[PDB]
């Protein structure tokens, strides 16, 4: 993937992370990446108006089931043991999503798809890097990120202000890319 | 009729000791001890399954040049049942008309053609993966495992309680 | 003509498609000399079978298959698709997504459903020769426009059968046009802006395009004959209130008094012309010009032309309602062409029942068939020429 | 290198030293940044803009009418410098948009530089066909062109050249019914000609920059070009 050169130094201001997990599943949802969908023979992006393919079906099923479990954490007045069960199920769904891309790109795997994996990695690098320059635009500074986390310096000393800054950047990136979490 | 159920944890397959027999392992409830205790279960006659790809225009097997006649599922059926069966020691199988889909990277493969689902018991020797026929281009499922066929054709999604009838 | 009985269709269709249909002639028509590798093998055919059953994807290999499939099921309707990369009848056998149109025809449709607010003679689904003037002028205008503006040499119109016709402009470069090209062309040829039954649907500027000028020059040969004599649009207050709705209100009183003091649509229209000329001198908009454009100019449908895989009735078929045969339109005989003389399957079966397969010559289809061989002779001549040179 | 303007769609295959490589990279970066800043400060058509950017070109020797000096050094410099900027700029969509803006400014200025006599042979060298019409054809079809023309006031069809184009090349132009069509051929003034060519050029550059973005990971393995090509513009 793409690894940013670190702005090495001492940063006295607040530092908050941005976990780029489920990035590849989110991409596969968004651009409809599937074996039945891509016209491999360097591949090309499939048609957007085309029907939602196979891999998106199961990964979106997992994401929606995780979302409904997340709802079940909002409703209080539940047995704590069942709350722990819901948390375990949500975490399992998270890791299964994260490994979705794993099962497709490896010579170690059955479904080794060099072009499909290359397309997914290219899209991931592109979107993370776009987030990088635009968060530069929004008058902050980024110092490190490789497809699984983003280090962000704040230039601020108020924790709540930093948190709401993270919330606003999360919301804007979520409205820029629909299924990314 | 006596029936019982268990929670299956393990699934073992062997290709040479007891080929075609997957020893499913699991965790059974017993009424006599009013608890759960270890159980073994095994299933035989897990037939190997193949999917022959009939061609469209019969080519000469020696050179690949066209022989001037079309190809049908019936055509590949006889071609198999005499020559391939005699060469690789097959005496019984259940050829059926089955339509399946392929959407992977094996080159020159129709997406939704017709497949000759050749279902023969696993005792007969497994066919070579690069088998080619005068009538059929290639066949899938050569070494595809009895364990995965069991898991895949019995709709057993992960570890779930298994109901078994007529326990021999 | 006698009245048509729709219950004789199951036998009449079988007889016609057994004996009289120009199968191999249509075969050359869609084969186009077999220049492309499998242009006819990827040709799309669409049929409507018995009991309103619709089936879409068929591909055929030769005239033998065409004959067998046509005489085996006897569809009520024959419909045409496009030509794709692989065979449409096995389209599912090819990988998903790879299925894409690469060549297709460009078609233009004008129908009586487009003139419900225009015709004072017929209902939505009815026609008459005295309302056929609009269709004739539309044919002539589209003819000149495509033949000179774009040089479209192989223009073929086919009569739909009841309330409209279809065109078939079969140049090769036309066959390889892109969706954007066809769209840009259809908005290039669009002048009528059909809204939510807006009173005014045609407006112009001071500068006049030669396109519109030539179109109107053609139309003026028909306005007096049709709008003012065949339709007589200025016979009643309600009759000319539709025109007054387009005319500015400052002219309404003078038009009303002129029409009351007159007694016929011709006199009222010439008074309208005088008053409109006075208004133009005082102020131009060319009122006489947009009103006639809104009353006569063809009102097209965007989708049928813009679709790279749209479906439309084939020629030489039969109309399920009226039974008329979807025959080409003779480019030389347009001003006097009539839809009620178009052969009907009942009459042509009676001709066959009153009797190398050239039996159409003894049938009333014969002149229109010779029109079809004339068109395909033009196609063959152009193919041979622009291939050899 | 057959003509001064050139469309950049054939990468060079020569061998150059590292010092010349960096000199070209830095010089073209300076040229494009100057184009950006000058276009921001001034209006794109004023003689002050034209003369100032001409002086910038002369001090950076990137373009000039053909002579003994022009053939070898300057146009070759333009070629390799543009392609190394392609490598530098294909990283991001924002950088691609920036580069496209400045190169359109550059190419429009260069086209304004070229005298009217040589634009014919430039279009001929451009490998995509366009046919200029004769004076007799212009005089015969002047009334049609004016009647079907856009809001350009008056009947005046001045010295501006008119070309013959396949209709499929000017889709957005003719689809507004603001041009005359003759047997599937259009006739167009110079401003719309340059608009069409710049739109086509931006399409080709977008596709080529996307392709080079697909080619970046292989070409970045070198260690003597990574720390530059990461930061020519940034
Ligand atoms: Zn009528």
Residue numbers in the entry:
A (entry chain A): 842 to 882, 898 to 1037
B (entry chain A): 338 to 505
C (entry chain C): 1 to 283, 289 to 360, 379 to 412
D (entry chain D): 22 to 255
Give excerpts from the publication:
SARS‐CoV nsp1 was chosen for the structural analysis as this variant showed somewhat stronger binding to human primosome in our pull‐down assays. We obtained a 3D reconstruction of the primosome at a global resolution of 3.8 Å after sharpening that clearly showed all components of the complex. Furthermore, the heterodimeric primase is held in an extended conformation, whereby the Fe‐S domain of Pri2—required for initiation of RNA primer synthesis 48 —is sequestered by interactions with both B and Pol α and unavailable to contact Pri1, which is excluded from the primosome core and largely solvent exposed. Altogether, the high‐resolution structural data obtained with X‐ray and cryo‐EM methods indicate that—in its unliganded form—the human primosome exists in a conformation that is incompatible with primer synthesis without the intervention of major conformational rearrangements. The structure shows that nsp1 binds to the Pol α subunit of the primosome. The globular domain of nsp1 docks onto the rim of the polymerase fold of Pol α, and its binding site is entirely contained within the inactive exonuclease domain of the polymerase, in agreement with our biochemical findings. A cluster of hydrophobic nsp1 residues at the center of the interface—including L27, V28, P109, V111, and G112—becomes buried upon complex formation, validating the observation that mutations of nsp1 residues V28 and V111 abrogate the interaction.
The DNA polymerase α (Pol α)–primase complex or primosome—responsible for initiating DNA synthesis during genomic duplication—was identified as a target of nonstructural protein 1 (nsp1), a major virulence factor in the SARS‐CoV‐2 infection. The nsp1 protein is present in α‐ and β‐coronaviruses but not in γ‐ or δ‐coronaviruses. nsp1 is a major virulence factor for SARS and MERS, due its pleiotropic activities as potent antagonist of virus‐ and IFN‐dependent signaling and suppressor of host mRNA translation.
